[model samples]
Target: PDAGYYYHDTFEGSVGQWTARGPAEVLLSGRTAYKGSESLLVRNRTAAWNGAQRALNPRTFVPGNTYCFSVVASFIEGASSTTFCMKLQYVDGSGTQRYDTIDMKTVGPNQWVHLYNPQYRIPSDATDMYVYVETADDTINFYIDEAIGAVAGTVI
Candidate 1:
């Protein structure tokens, strides 16, 4: 039988959450008083996507390695916007930031979409990653599936 997955506290959330200070911009939300635990709903609060990310440093990344990142995304027709090429970003302790972000987006109109990125490259100089989600949207709902740092290894 497939072993059930276990999760650790890696990144933060939205609806009532916001990312740490960003370089280009802040494209993330924080967690709030959810039904029981915390909700992972990012509120875009605009018309178009602004290519931003939530600053987080999950302990599952590895330097000089490749990992995958994925999120469940969705939006209302005129509720939230989209971008042509949307991705995430991360900065290491060595002051090296790698935007090896991938593209995960939907068009027209849809509900909550599941995003699964299969690879996120770690910068050569990246020591520790200051997490962030890069994309362009006013408000959005990001249901993360799996986001692992290269040096930190696999995270769930």
Candidate 2:
């Protein structure tokens, strides 16, 4: 059977629905990609928490539901190696903001790494949810492609 409620973006020809988080800037690049000839370039990041972000719809990414998430990320300019993370940011029922790390990987220059989480449960009271990519080091420029979100246990 096909993966249910799947969301996939190859970032070809455009930046798609992604936007920059914090002071970061995002644009479409033809430099590299995980599958296609184009990818999303995240640049002008002034902090470790700045990168590309995508808003999550509560109707599709339901609270309390488990989902699979994955993305291919790489750095062309930075330290020899940096730890990249896939994070979820949301507001709790108490109005407090929360950031959760879904996955992380240490990637070297020009090395593409896949950040994958086969089972990630959304907080029951999460609101204003967003998913993003960031590096452990500040000001590192990176590229991302082949991002996917689907029902839990979905293989990609």
Candidate 3:
């Protein structure tokens, strides 16, 4: 369940139809969810960007508001370059489509960890925007659950 002013996916019935750059699937195991009954599974490929991304409607959000993202992730095995990337693709301080990434280190093999990217101020000139999470390792697999996108008057 998503709380606060946010859009969330528990991968319950579908994978939210996120644009998949590589191999991705929705898993419906009883143990997959952080709050519900499903999760998103992505199969990492060598030298390929793999995982899920959902774009936010440009007019649905207000600029200068603080935004945050949270998710639960775990690696299938001990993988190399195992960085969990939570990135916001939007206009940046450089007046370009820059990605502000919050790369968090996972907790080794078979360990599930909750990760949160702190609030960021959306630029007034922001055009396209997206929320994405992916594994940076080549030829590895990761599971994601309860991915959330939120905005508020203050940082969460």
Candidate 4:
């Protein structure tokens, strides 16, 4: 029973007001394009936990409603463990920031791959929400494009 709510970013001109965390660097580049003119070059040249996020306003996500989060990315495996983490960052009613994540060992000197988190529901007590994608542990040369957050639909 979802209403086809949607949020997406192609990472073409700007990063679409998403916050960059820690040492994570993001830039639009024509080197890799999933669909349009450019893709997002997300790099963490140094050793640190870094990523990108966009807040989901009005908290449209209701408790027990199903949603899907997805992104297309290619990796060059430049540093240590190149695990990718995607999640919903939220503040609980208790006021603690939390990350509900799907951590995948997607180390690649490979092509663009689609990653998704399916059959997920918002926490009943979540007061605020943001969607995030990050290089977990350590990663480099990650080209990301066409991220989608949708209700009752899959990333195509």
Ranking by lDDT: 2, 4, 3, 1
| Candidate lDDT values, in order | 0.41, 0.89, 0.65, 0.69
Q: Candidate 3 overall Cα lDDT vs. reference?
A: 0.65
Candidate 4 backbone clash number: 0
Q: Mind giving the per-residue lDDT tens digits that candidate 4 earns over 34-132?
A: 889888887654643567667775445665577777787777557533567777788887899888874344655657767677667777777668777
Question: What is the alpha-carbon lDDT of model 2 when measured against the actual structure?
Answer: 0.89
User: What's the TM for model 3?
Assistant: 0.76
- What is the number of backbone collisions in each predicted candidate, taken in the order shown? 44, 0, 0, 0
lDDT of 3 at 51: 67
Write down the RMSD of candidate 1 (Cα, Å).
6.7
Which of candidates 1 and 2 reaches a greater lDDT?
Answer: 2
Best by TM-score: 2
Q: If both were scored by TM-score, which would come out higher, candidate 3 or candidate 4?
A: 4
Model 4: residues >4 Å from true position, as ranges? 1-5, 44-48, 103-105
Ranking by TM-score: 2, 4, 3, 1
Per-residue lDDT of model 1, residues 1-156, tens digit only: 012222222234432233423323333323332123343433343433433344434444555655655444444444445532335455656666565545556554444344444455656556435444433543444333133323223332
- What alpha-carbon RMSD in Å does predicted model 3 have with respect to the real structure? 3.5
Report the lDDT tens digits of candidate 3 across residue range 1-156. 145646777788777745655465434445555667667776544443566677877665566656666778876664643677776667665668776674465567666677686565666766678777776555566678877767643233
